[PDB]
């Protein structure tokens, strides 16, 4: 039954072999032949025959030398050099990684080997723990040795193999040099730069292949040509590997104040304007003027949302008069005084309390005068409209969705260095914010340039290096950067605005970055030194966009992530950075200074609608809405 | 030289979009459609095997059709003009190595770029790039119109206009009030290419006068063969518009490959110009014009910088003395890439 | 040379005569709701649909000029590498005859030699040369030799 081969596959749950060591050696030895030559994995005779062939077993023993915990070739079969065997890093409460998983190994080298590697590199559950054949023989596990000698192995042949088999697992656990086809990226660490090279975890990827199909998670598949040339798991999966897929989620009414007239003080104020005899001039004037000042404020409030509408819409870029007459030129506004005063009395007439005051002769001139006055009176780095073409939509080998956050932190800094070489004063970026207005997935894949000659000499033919399977998208986004200048005297000038346009990088997330088109240009590079003005402008953004906020939840597994995503609708997984496998050292092949290996860190973020922060207020926005490193 | 050396790209374009105007709205996208067709059974292996050995089939077996699914795109009835546009940014980014593992290699590459700048030479590169914009060769297979007009605006306030692009050759001399605009454009670009801290940005539009229902040729996608027979074998590239509709487009790197087609320095015989490539690749003939065996490729030439700087420094300049090898090398540094293991 | 032609024809018709535009090649129906026979249309700039004839359907007619086989002209075939005849479901230039495009493509060195030795300007060109040129006009793929 093919189900036996499925359960022994690297992408399936491990099965127990306790008390069945004899048939386990038979099945595992029988797997070293091509499927076309074997009618059953259970034939004791075939196994006894295969076991006597020292050459066949020797060819199998040799594969042990390349068993690994982390796979340096995964994304690109061209990488050449040594294997990597490292114990999982300590658990970080806020990061999903291999730290919470048990120890497992895999195999990658020649395409030809595949079958021969299955004798020692195939895992199983034994004595209620995770092991494999190589480990039980190296550790001198007597039950397995007794069954193996019983199947026809000479004690002298076993005594020699225990030594050679152990020797193959005792060295070459860390690469000597950095391989020429590996990735290298650099960031600040403890006040200086270090180069980081990521690598994929065998145990972590193999588990994900099972969880997405069992827990019914959103996913897609990445293809690999020549699966035998990339690794055990990719071959077993037929060149199709599953990854997570979590993309972002991208009036006829009165404009008048709903409660300016609900203040009992307003009613009193009116009574005071109306006033009373019996007092001195000073007393009457003091009460009167106070009432008027109050009312003045109310007049400003009453028309408030209306004036707000005007300023917002007119500055930024139907048919009712309270909308159209305010859209007009401010110089015209004084001539609306009689109309406003009319509406005012009407609004009072329609109120439960104002029926005692509306159109009363006493209030005529007061109201008209204060309105006339009001009418006469009426008469952080923000990057807007940025477009990115062909951004990399595959954040890490495990997850598709929002581009890796490590890339935005990167962008902020290259931009800072360019500006610093232009302006003599020290300039520093504390935080960086991200907003999403447009998100479009692009299908297909890029064709590589023919940069490789078919033969090194005496050939006039050009070949294609190879093909990869990736995912790309187009973005439209705004950034709000918190800019700080250390010096007491600052440079808030046009010159600096030009230098801010020049310093802007051309590259973003692997794609191409452009400003808004020239024929429709506005000031896309403004600067604010006031939280109130900046927040007010940001509340006006279109309702169909997304703000991305940091999350609070701590997740330690994909199963915990599955539950958190089932419960919320705003939660998305993101790539957050790297986790080190070793301390930084000097190593040949490093681009600059020290080198360290790491594995990708999977974390989470929230998607917040513009409507939610219009209500949350500027306090919550400037506390929670900005991201930083460490 | 050294283990690592590389440059990034200094001249990058955008995505081009096709659209047209109506009397009711200023921007209507050109879009693509999908359809089933009846094909032919023709070609080798359809009837012959091995080397011209007929295979055994009956006479009627080739009269059958071969159905296929394709995407296609046509201009709708009664549209008089079709418009296409893209954006362009240019940075003076060949003055410094993106990375370099050796300070002694670095100071030399810097010396060379500067020695070249002051004798002239950026004008030469700018003239060649400018010519390719105004000629219109970036329309590829869509150049066959009844009349083509090209218009350019820049961030410095200039405007250029070619009343009819259909006749401007690579080799020759342009008509008056056209030759002149080429000179003016050359100046803006020659500066943008070499002097830092200048922001420059261009916006290039063109118009095509077309036939009644003329076929249009946008970029094609790279795909797997579907196994479904309900999915198109030839799929075309589109861009999402601000209103949510899709439109036909030409990919950035396809516009780019056209703009840099300027190399007629090979074999001392100009012919037609090649896309700059370290080995002189010729796609039409499937070969290479600067095969390593000739000594004419980039990698051999990258080691003669010490000799070139010496000449550039000893030369008076302002003349016609700059050799093909120095111009070639500067052109390659402009299309930056990986020059490692040196 | 940028050459264009613009062809319009007028049809004088009957009182309510039936018109025959191109048909779609459709998938097998099973929903009892989709038409069994569907016609091709184009979308006008104003949103209306109109009847049309497909590009390659016009082309199939224009290039129907092949009567060089069997030394008896009869009616012409649509140029085809194997001489396909749709009316009788057969093929006139079956590979077994030596008359197809691929056999002929390999003799080019010999044809050039003849043309060069000939005078020309007259009626001397043979059927085999005309056939070959007609196929190169309807270009396609000629590969995997």
PDB file of C-alpha atoms in Angstrom, chain A residues 227-467:
ATOM      1  CA  UNK A 227      13.229  18.824  -7.453  1.00  0.00           C
ATOM      2  CA  UNK A 228      16.011  16.212  -6.876  1.00  0.00           C
ATOM      3  CA  UNK A 229      18.605  19.087  -7.101  1.00  0.00           C
ATOM      4  CA  UNK A 230      17.002  21.124  -4.196  1.00  0.00           C
ATOM      5  CA  UNK A 231      16.246  18.606  -1.362  1.00  0.00           C
ATOM      6  CA  UNK A 232      14.514  15.612   0.345  1.00  0.00           C
ATOM      7  CA  UNK A 233      11.273  17.504   1.049  1.00  0.00           C
ATOM      8  CA  UNK A 234      10.913  19.311  -2.304  1.00  0.00           C
ATOM      9  CA  UNK A 235      11.468  16.016  -4.147  1.00  0.00           C
ATOM     10  CA  UNK A 236       8.941  14.148  -1.966  1.00  0.00           C
ATOM     11  CA  UNK A 237       6.379  16.943  -2.669  1.00  0.00           C
ATOM     12  CA  UNK A 238       6.889  16.604  -6.487  1.00  0.00           C
ATOM     13  CA  UNK A 239       8.332  20.151  -6.880  1.00  0.00           C
ATOM     14  CA  UNK A 240       5.206  21.897  -5.428  1.00  0.00           C
ATOM     15  CA  UNK A 241       5.606  23.468  -1.916  1.00  0.00           C
ATOM     16  CA  UNK A 242       2.765  25.136   0.019  1.00  0.00           C
ATOM     17  CA  UNK A 243       3.036  28.621   1.609  1.00  0.00           C
ATOM     18  CA  UNK A 244       0.642  30.873   3.593  1.00  0.00           C
ATOM     19  CA  UNK A 245      -1.370  33.540   1.700  1.00  0.00           C
ATOM     20  CA  UNK A 246      -2.768  36.452   3.755  1.00  0.00           C
ATOM     21  CA  UNK A 247      -3.202  39.643   1.653  1.00  0.00           C
ATOM     22  CA  UNK A 248      -4.353  43.001   3.193  1.00  0.00           C
ATOM     23  CA  UNK A 249      -8.135  43.958   3.097  1.00  0.00           C
ATOM     24  CA  UNK A 250      -7.749  46.718   0.391  1.00  0.00           C
ATOM     25  CA  UNK A 251     -25.599  62.581   1.784  1.00  0.00           C
ATOM     26  CA  UNK A 252     -28.496  65.099   1.934  1.00  0.00           C
ATOM     27  CA  UNK A 253     -27.975  65.753   5.657  1.00  0.00           C
ATOM     28  CA  UNK A 254     -27.566  68.957   7.610  1.00  0.00           C
ATOM     29  CA  UNK A 255     -23.953  70.099   8.180  1.00  0.00           C
ATOM     30  CA  UNK A 256     -24.957  72.053  11.286  1.00  0.00           C
ATOM     31  CA  UNK A 257     -23.922  71.460  14.879  1.00  0.00           C
ATOM     32  CA  UNK A 258     -26.045  68.839  16.610  1.00  0.00           C
ATOM     33  CA  UNK A 259     -25.891  70.302  20.124  1.00  0.00           C
ATOM     34  CA  UNK A 260     -24.638  73.913  20.355  1.00  0.00           C
ATOM     35  CA  UNK A 261     -28.137  74.773  21.452  1.00  0.00           C
ATOM     36  CA  UNK A 262     -28.290  72.103  24.147  1.00  0.00           C
ATOM     37  CA  UNK A 263     -26.294  74.123  26.579  1.00  0.00           C
ATOM     38  CA  UNK A 264     -28.378  75.654  29.361  1.00  0.00           C
ATOM     39  CA  UNK A 265     -25.726  78.352  29.540  1.00  0.00           C
ATOM     40  CA  UNK A 266     -26.535  79.372  25.983  1.00  0.00           C
ATOM     41  CA  UNK A 267     -30.095  79.957  27.051  1.00  0.00           C
ATOM     42  CA  UNK A 268     -28.861  82.031  30.000  1.00  0.00           C
ATOM     43  CA  UNK A 269     -26.494  83.924  27.755  1.00  0.00           C
ATOM     44  CA  UNK A 270     -29.421  85.067  25.670  1.00  0.00           C
ATOM     45  CA  UNK A 271     -31.249  86.193  28.767  1.00  0.00           C
ATOM     46  CA  UNK A 272     -28.215  88.232  29.723  1.00  0.00           C
ATOM     47  CA  UNK A 273     -28.088  89.962  26.322  1.00  0.00           C
ATOM     48  CA  UNK A 274     -31.747  90.716  26.779  1.00  0.00           C
ATOM     49  CA  UNK A 275     -30.693  91.801  30.297  1.00  0.00           C
ATOM     50  CA  UNK A 276     -32.317  93.685  33.121  1.00  0.00           C
ATOM     51  CA  UNK A 277     -32.481  97.188  34.671  1.00  0.00           C
ATOM     52  CA  UNK A 278     -31.465  98.004  38.255  1.00  0.00           C
ATOM     53  CA  UNK A 279     -27.717  97.516  37.836  1.00  0.00           C
ATOM     54  CA  UNK A 280     -24.857  99.947  37.202  1.00  0.00           C
ATOM     55  CA  UNK A 281     -23.240 100.487  33.809  1.00  0.00           C
ATOM     56  CA  UNK A 282     -20.166  98.469  34.768  1.00  0.00           C
ATOM     57  CA  UNK A 283     -22.207  95.506  35.970  1.00  0.00           C
ATOM     58  CA  UNK A 284     -24.438  95.429  32.928  1.00  0.00           C
ATOM     59  CA  UNK A 285     -21.516  95.755  30.556  1.00  0.00           C
ATOM     60  CA  UNK A 286     -19.578  93.000  32.290  1.00  0.00           C
ATOM     61  CA  UNK A 287     -22.491  90.567  32.222  1.00  0.00           C
ATOM     62  CA  UNK A 288     -23.413  91.572  28.675  1.00  0.00           C
ATOM     63  CA  UNK A 289     -19.924  91.333  27.215  1.00  0.00           C
ATOM     64  CA  UNK A 290     -19.363  87.990  28.889  1.00  0.00           C
ATOM     65  CA  UNK A 291     -22.572  86.648  27.435  1.00  0.00           C
ATOM     66  CA  UNK A 292     -21.593  87.979  24.022  1.00  0.00           C
ATOM     67  CA  UNK A 293     -18.162  86.411  24.155  1.00  0.00           C
ATOM     68  CA  UNK A 294     -19.761  83.122  25.051  1.00  0.00           C
ATOM     69  CA  UNK A 295     -22.274  83.466  22.250  1.00  0.00           C
ATOM     70  CA  UNK A 296     -19.511  84.497  19.857  1.00  0.00           C
ATOM     71  CA  UNK A 297     -17.888  81.154  20.571  1.00  0.00           C
ATOM     72  CA  UNK A 298     -21.185  79.366  20.030  1.00  0.00           C
ATOM     73  CA  UNK A 299     -21.581  81.113  16.688  1.00  0.00           C
ATOM     74  CA  UNK A 300     -18.156  79.812  15.751  1.00  0.00           C
ATOM     75  CA  UNK A 301     -19.102  76.345  16.988  1.00  0.00           C
ATOM     76  CA  UNK A 302     -22.567  76.300  15.332  1.00  0.00           C
ATOM     77  CA  UNK A 303     -21.008  76.841  11.904  1.00  0.00           C
ATOM     78  CA  UNK A 304     -18.005  74.778  12.860  1.00  0.00           C
ATOM     79  CA  UNK A 305     -18.477  71.535  10.961  1.00  0.00           C
ATOM     80  CA  UNK A 306     -19.535  73.650   8.004  1.00  0.00           C
ATOM     81  CA  UNK A 307     -16.421  75.736   7.986  1.00  0.00           C
ATOM     82  CA  UNK A 308     -14.423  72.531   8.595  1.00  0.00           C
ATOM     83  CA  UNK A 309     -16.030  70.967   5.534  1.00  0.00           C
ATOM     84  CA  UNK A 310     -15.019  73.985   3.467  1.00  0.00           C
ATOM     85  CA  UNK A 311     -11.428  74.143   4.568  1.00  0.00           C
ATOM     86  CA  UNK A 312     -10.873  70.410   4.259  1.00  0.00           C
ATOM     87  CA  UNK A 313     -12.461  69.992   0.866  1.00  0.00           C
ATOM     88  CA  UNK A 314     -11.379  73.260  -0.722  1.00  0.00           C
ATOM     89  CA  UNK A 315      -7.759  72.914   0.373  1.00  0.00           C
ATOM     90  CA  UNK A 316      -7.466  69.236  -0.503  1.00  0.00           C
ATOM     91  CA  UNK A 317      -9.562  69.024  -3.645  1.00  0.00           C
ATOM     92  CA  UNK A 318     -23.598  68.744  -3.700  1.00  0.00           C
ATOM     93  CA  UNK A 319     -25.623  71.799  -4.622  1.00  0.00           C
ATOM     94  CA  UNK A 320     -27.180  72.741  -1.285  1.00  0.00           C
ATOM     95  CA  UNK A 321     -26.583  76.371  -0.342  1.00  0.00           C
ATOM     96  CA  UNK A 322     -24.985  75.624   3.049  1.00  0.00           C
ATOM     97  CA  UNK A 323     -22.455  73.666   0.993  1.00  0.00           C
ATOM     98  CA  UNK A 324     -22.102  75.784  -2.129  1.00  0.00           C
ATOM     99  CA  UNK A 325     -22.074  79.232  -0.564  1.00  0.00           C
ATOM    100  CA  UNK A 326     -19.137  78.203   1.638  1.00  0.00           C
ATOM    101  CA  UNK A 327     -17.270  76.655  -1.285  1.00  0.00           C
ATOM    102  CA  UNK A 328     -17.198  80.149  -2.794  1.00  0.00           C
ATOM    103  CA  UNK A 329     -14.376  82.749  -2.305  1.00  0.00           C
ATOM    104  CA  UNK A 330     -13.863  83.895   1.280  1.00  0.00           C
ATOM    105  CA  UNK A 331     -14.287  87.533   0.209  1.00  0.00           C
ATOM    106  CA  UNK A 332     -17.891  86.863  -0.555  1.00  0.00           C
ATOM    107  CA  UNK A 333     -18.750  85.516   2.867  1.00  0.00           C
ATOM    108  CA  UNK A 334     -19.644  88.825   4.559  1.00  0.00           C
ATOM    109  CA  UNK A 335     -22.643  89.131   2.186  1.00  0.00           C
ATOM    110  CA  UNK A 336     -24.146  85.962   3.576  1.00  0.00           C
ATOM    111  CA  UNK A 337     -24.650  87.543   7.000  1.00  0.00           C
ATOM    112  CA  UNK A 338     -28.391  88.080   6.663  1.00  0.00           C
ATOM    113  CA  UNK A 339     -28.879  84.513   5.420  1.00  0.00           C
ATOM    114  CA  UNK A 340     -26.901  83.054   8.247  1.00  0.00           C
ATOM    115  CA  UNK A 341     -28.740  85.125  10.780  1.00  0.00           C
ATOM    116  CA  UNK A 342     -32.030  83.926   9.247  1.00  0.00           C
ATOM    117  CA  UNK A 343     -31.056  80.271   9.518  1.00  0.00           C
ATOM    118  CA  UNK A 344     -29.920  80.901  13.054  1.00  0.00           C
ATOM    119  CA  UNK A 345     -33.322  82.046  14.191  1.00  0.00           C
ATOM    120  CA  UNK A 346     -34.874  79.094  12.394  1.00  0.00           C
ATOM    121  CA  UNK A 347     -32.616  76.688  14.180  1.00  0.00           C
ATOM    122  CA  UNK A 348     -33.686  78.203  17.427  1.00  0.00           C
ATOM    123  CA  UNK A 349     -37.343  78.008  16.278  1.00  0.00           C
ATOM    124  CA  UNK A 350     -36.940  74.316  15.735  1.00  0.00           C
ATOM    125  CA  UNK A 351     -35.493  73.767  19.192  1.00  0.00           C
ATOM    126  CA  UNK A 352     -37.417  72.974  22.382  1.00  0.00           C
ATOM    127  CA  UNK A 353     -35.868  75.938  24.209  1.00  0.00           C
ATOM    128  CA  UNK A 354     -35.320  78.420  21.371  1.00  0.00           C
ATOM    129  CA  UNK A 355     -39.145  78.947  20.952  1.00  0.00           C
ATOM    130  CA  UNK A 356     -38.816  81.627  23.648  1.00  0.00           C
ATOM    131  CA  UNK A 357     -36.066  83.467  21.814  1.00  0.00           C
ATOM    132  CA  UNK A 358     -36.201  83.055  18.067  1.00  0.00           C
ATOM    133  CA  UNK A 359     -36.954  86.226  16.124  1.00  0.00           C
ATOM    134  CA  UNK A 360     -37.193  88.200  19.370  1.00  0.00           C
ATOM    135  CA  UNK A 361     -36.421  91.891  18.597  1.00  0.00           C
ATOM    136  CA  UNK A 362     -34.004  92.056  21.501  1.00  0.00           C
ATOM    137  CA  UNK A 363     -31.514  89.620  19.918  1.00  0.00           C
ATOM    138  CA  UNK A 364     -31.531  91.057  16.420  1.00  0.00           C
ATOM    139  CA  UNK A 365     -28.554  93.360  16.337  1.00  0.00           C
ATOM    140  CA  UNK A 366     -26.456  91.318  18.753  1.00  0.00           C
ATOM    141  CA  UNK A 367     -26.694  88.194  16.639  1.00  0.00           C
ATOM    142  CA  UNK A 368     -26.154  90.028  13.355  1.00  0.00           C
ATOM    143  CA  UNK A 369     -23.158  91.963  14.648  1.00  0.00           C
ATOM    144  CA  UNK A 370     -21.312  88.949  16.017  1.00  0.00           C
ATOM    145  CA  UNK A 371     -21.942  86.979  12.833  1.00  0.00           C
ATOM    146  CA  UNK A 372     -20.715  89.840  10.724  1.00  0.00           C
ATOM    147  CA  UNK A 373     -17.529  89.946  12.830  1.00  0.00           C
ATOM    148  CA  UNK A 374     -16.991  86.203  12.442  1.00  0.00           C
ATOM    149  CA  UNK A 375     -17.441  86.361   8.697  1.00  0.00           C
ATOM    150  CA  UNK A 376     -14.916  89.167   8.383  1.00  0.00           C
ATOM    151  CA  UNK A 377     -12.492  87.054  10.383  1.00  0.00           C
ATOM    152  CA  UNK A 378     -13.136  84.155   8.068  1.00  0.00           C
ATOM    153  CA  UNK A 379     -12.619  86.463   5.097  1.00  0.00           C
ATOM    154  CA  UNK A 380       7.031  64.979  11.100  1.00  0.00           C
ATOM    155  CA  UNK A 381       7.686  64.326   7.371  1.00  0.00           C
ATOM    156  CA  UNK A 382       4.685  63.379   5.166  1.00  0.00           C
ATOM    157  CA  UNK A 383       5.439  61.607   1.830  1.00  0.00           C
ATOM    158  CA  UNK A 384       2.318  61.415  -0.390  1.00  0.00           C
ATOM    159  CA  UNK A 385       1.364  59.633  -3.666  1.00  0.00           C
ATOM    160  CA  UNK A 386       4.339  57.200  -3.988  1.00  0.00           C
ATOM    161  CA  UNK A 387       4.012  54.416  -6.604  1.00  0.00           C
ATOM    162  CA  UNK A 388       6.013  51.176  -6.635  1.00  0.00           C
ATOM    163  CA  UNK A 389       6.232  48.859  -9.646  1.00  0.00           C
ATOM    164  CA  UNK A 390       6.978  45.106  -9.358  1.00  0.00           C
ATOM    165  CA  UNK A 391       7.485  44.911  -5.544  1.00  0.00           C
ATOM    166  CA  UNK A 392       8.341  41.469  -4.114  1.00  0.00           C
ATOM    167  CA  UNK A 393       5.098  40.052  -2.648  1.00  0.00           C
ATOM    168  CA  UNK A 394       6.858  36.982  -1.132  1.00  0.00           C
ATOM    169  CA  UNK A 395       8.121  38.258   2.236  1.00  0.00           C
ATOM    170  CA  UNK A 396       9.820  34.991   3.386  1.00  0.00           C
ATOM    171  CA  UNK A 397       9.760  31.425   1.950  1.00  0.00           C
ATOM    172  CA  UNK A 398       6.816  30.625   4.335  1.00  0.00           C
ATOM    173  CA  UNK A 399       4.451  33.598   3.702  1.00  0.00           C
ATOM    174  CA  UNK A 400       2.904  35.666   0.886  1.00  0.00           C
ATOM    175  CA  UNK A 401       1.192  39.007   1.632  1.00  0.00           C
ATOM    176  CA  UNK A 402       2.383  42.435   2.847  1.00  0.00           C
ATOM    177  CA  UNK A 403       6.095  43.049   1.859  1.00  0.00           C
ATOM    178  CA  UNK A 404       8.665  42.283   4.592  1.00  0.00           C
ATOM    179  CA  UNK A 405       8.862  45.030   7.264  1.00  0.00           C
ATOM    180  CA  UNK A 406      12.703  44.558   7.417  1.00  0.00           C
ATOM    181  CA  UNK A 407      12.729  46.200   3.916  1.00  0.00           C
ATOM    182  CA  UNK A 408      10.883  49.408   5.047  1.00  0.00           C
ATOM    183  CA  UNK A 409      13.223  49.909   8.064  1.00  0.00           C
ATOM    184  CA  UNK A 410      16.005  49.443   5.463  1.00  0.00           C
ATOM    185  CA  UNK A 411      14.491  52.129   3.129  1.00  0.00           C
ATOM    186  CA  UNK A 412      14.134  54.706   6.037  1.00  0.00           C
ATOM    187  CA  UNK A 413      17.891  54.447   6.726  1.00  0.00           C
ATOM    188  CA  UNK A 414      19.268  54.581   3.119  1.00  0.00           C
ATOM    189  CA  UNK A 415      17.083  57.750   2.805  1.00  0.00           C
ATOM    190  CA  UNK A 416      18.552  59.168   6.073  1.00  0.00           C
ATOM    191  CA  UNK A 417      22.191  58.551   4.925  1.00  0.00           C
ATOM    192  CA  UNK A 418      21.586  60.284   1.564  1.00  0.00           C
ATOM    193  CA  UNK A 419      20.046  63.338   3.330  1.00  0.00           C
ATOM    194  CA  UNK A 420      22.881  63.434   5.942  1.00  0.00           C
ATOM    195  CA  UNK A 421      25.510  63.725   3.126  1.00  0.00           C
ATOM    196  CA  UNK A 422      23.608  66.843   1.869  1.00  0.00           C
ATOM    197  CA  UNK A 423      22.847  68.731   5.168  1.00  0.00           C
ATOM    198  CA  UNK A 424      25.762  69.568   7.548  1.00  0.00           C
ATOM    199  CA  UNK A 425      23.531  69.178  10.679  1.00  0.00           C
ATOM    200  CA  UNK A 426      22.886  65.784  12.335  1.00  0.00           C
ATOM    201  CA  UNK A 427      19.431  64.352  11.312  1.00  0.00           C
ATOM    202  CA  UNK A 428      17.864  61.172  12.925  1.00  0.00           C
ATOM    203  CA  UNK A 429      14.670  59.024  12.300  1.00  0.00           C
ATOM    204  CA  UNK A 430      13.013  57.712  15.582  1.00  0.00           C
ATOM    205  CA  UNK A 431       9.962  56.013  13.906  1.00  0.00           C
ATOM    206  CA  UNK A 432       8.309  55.098  10.502  1.00  0.00           C
ATOM    207  CA  UNK A 433       4.526  54.686   9.666  1.00  0.00           C
ATOM    208  CA  UNK A 434       2.938  52.712   6.729  1.00  0.00           C
ATOM    209  CA  UNK A 435      -0.470  53.390   4.926  1.00  0.00           C
ATOM    210  CA  UNK A 436      -2.000  51.213   2.085  1.00  0.00           C
ATOM    211  CA  UNK A 437      -4.205  52.869  -0.666  1.00  0.00           C
ATOM    212  CA  UNK A 438      -3.767  50.372  -3.597  1.00  0.00           C
ATOM    213  CA  UNK A 439      -2.618  46.657  -3.703  1.00  0.00           C
ATOM    214  CA  UNK A 440      -2.542  44.677  -7.053  1.00  0.00           C
ATOM    215  CA  UNK A 441      -1.134  41.105  -7.436  1.00  0.00           C
ATOM    216  CA  UNK A 442       0.750  40.491 -10.751  1.00  0.00           C
ATOM    217  CA  UNK A 443       0.724  36.923 -12.230  1.00  0.00           C
ATOM    218  CA  UNK A 444       3.609  35.103 -14.013  1.00  0.00           C
ATOM    219  CA  UNK A 445       7.419  35.297 -13.527  1.00  0.00           C
ATOM    220  CA  UNK A 446      10.481  37.214 -14.917  1.00  0.00           C
ATOM    221  CA  UNK A 447      12.807  35.724 -17.634  1.00  0.00           C
ATOM    222  CA  UNK A 448      16.564  35.961 -16.716  1.00  0.00           C
ATOM    223  CA  UNK A 449      19.067  37.799 -19.049  1.00  0.00           C
ATOM    224  CA  UNK A 450      21.289  35.328 -21.047  1.00  0.00           C
ATOM    225  CA  UNK A 451      24.447  36.161 -18.952  1.00  0.00           C
ATOM    226  CA  UNK A 452      25.979  32.609 -19.160  1.00  0.00           C
ATOM    227  CA  UNK A 453      27.971  31.263 -22.235  1.00  0.00           C
ATOM    228  CA  UNK A 454      26.908  27.679 -23.264  1.00  0.00           C
ATOM    229  CA  UNK A 455      30.624  26.602 -23.100  1.00  0.00           C
ATOM    230  CA  UNK A 456      33.589  28.621 -21.659  1.00  0.00           C
ATOM    231  CA  UNK A 457      35.666  28.530 -24.935  1.00  0.00           C
ATOM    232  CA  UNK A 458      35.235  27.870 -28.742  1.00  0.00           C
ATOM    233  CA  UNK A 459      31.356  28.181 -28.641  1.00  0.00           C
ATOM    234  CA  UNK A 460      29.185  31.117 -30.016  1.00  0.00           C
ATOM    235  CA  UNK A 461      25.911  30.082 -28.239  1.00  0.00           C
ATOM    236  CA  UNK A 462      24.385  31.837 -25.121  1.00  0.00           C
ATOM    237  CA  UNK A 463      22.312  29.890 -22.457  1.00  0.00           C
ATOM    238  CA  UNK A 464      19.781  31.012 -19.745  1.00  0.00           C
ATOM    239  CA  UNK A 465      21.092  30.709 -16.131  1.00  0.00           C
ATOM    240  CA  UNK A 466      17.838  29.106 -14.754  1.00  0.00           C
ATOM    241  CA  UNK A 467      14.225  30.030 -13.714  1.00  0.00           C
TER     242      UNK A 467
END
